[PDB]
Amino acid sequence: MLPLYLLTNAKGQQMQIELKNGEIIQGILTNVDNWMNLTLSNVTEYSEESAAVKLNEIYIRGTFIKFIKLQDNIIDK
RNA sequence: AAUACAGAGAUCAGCAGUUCCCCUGCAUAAGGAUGAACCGUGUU
């Protein structure tokens, strides 16, 4: 299935975003749009994968994402 | 008129062309017959 559909239904799951600058964002997905802009709650962002700021909500532009690790649960969920 | 002469003086065959008439083609005119499952006012 399409990446976007996959995302739209991962709403409420936990996922890990790598940004183009190296920052890693662990959080629970709360919203997606057609340009893959995200909003996540219960957030922890890291300066790099080596690792630590906790944030309540984060908005991420989709053009800035290298990849998004999904929970293995994904296919059945 | 007398004479000199020279003195009795081609055939077999083919094709097209006019004239009507039939067969078969193509053209030009008019005429008809029948067949063809589909419907134009924010990433390069």
H, E, C per residue of A23-52? CEEEEEEEEECCCCCEEEEEEEEECCCCCC
For chain A, the C-alpha Rg in angstroms (whole number) is: 12
Q: Method of determination?
A: cryo-EM
Give the integer Cα–Cα distance in Å for A50 and A58. 21
CA–C1' distance A55–B7 (Å)? 164
Domains and CATH numbers, chain A: 1-77 (2.30.30.100)
- Single out the residue of A36, A38, A71, A32 nearest to residue A57, CA to CA: A38
Q: Under 8 Å CB-to-CB from A65, ≥6 apart: which residues?
A: A17, A18, A19, A20, A36, A38
Separation between the CA of A36 and the C1’ of B20 (whole angstroms): 99
SS3 A74: helix
Resolution for the entry shown, Å: 3.8
State the nucleotide closest to A4 in CA–C1' terms: B43
Cα pseudo-dihedral A16, A61, A4, A75, rounded to 10: 10
User: Cα dihedral sign for A63, A17, A57, A6?
Assistant: positive
CA/C1' separation A48–B15 (Å): 113
First to last CA, chain A: 13
Strand B bases, protein C-beta under 7 A: 42-43
